[PDB]
Amino acid sequence: MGPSENDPNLFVALYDFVASGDNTLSITKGEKLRVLGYNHNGEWCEAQTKNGQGWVPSNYITPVNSLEKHSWYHGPVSRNAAEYLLSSGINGSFLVRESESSPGQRSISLRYEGRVYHYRINTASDGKLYVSSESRFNTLAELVHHHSTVADGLITTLHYPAP
């Protein structure tokens, strides 16, 4: 009843936002939200709470379980900075990055044999994530475990970090 405590899409309101009509969602400071998607520049979020669904400014809310906590998820990184981060490493070294504009456009950057390969992570109609079209997953963590076991689309497997 409500999102799971560790849901990556669980957000908390940093400030109160008061809705203008519908399509905007009123939220209070301290109140939890579940974010579904961002507008074109990532500045507005389609949120959902115990009161309904609608857009909210992304700068009035903050992640409760940021994916940045895993070493391989890096947050906003350009295609070129990701190549700098991967200018050393063995085959399979990798990173998931967000576009600087929309946090919804992710890529995987992967080192294989001295050069870096870049792959868009697609979100399907239902929300399933995938890189290859028949291998779709619910969570990003599941996509990277699958692509660590088997390449299946990529040039080589992902190297899952030792702990």
Question: DSSP per residue over the chain, as a string?
Answer: --S-TT-TTEEEESS-B--SSSSB--B-TT-EEEEEEE-TTSSEEEEEETTEEEEEEGGGEEESS-GGGSTTEEEE--HHHHHHHTSS--TT-EEEEE-SS-TT-EEEEEEETTEEEEEEEEE-TTS-EESSTT-EESSHHHHHHHHHH--BTBSS---PPP-
Domains for the chain: give ranges and CATH numbers.
Answer: 1-66 (2.30.30.40), 67-163 (3.30.505.10)
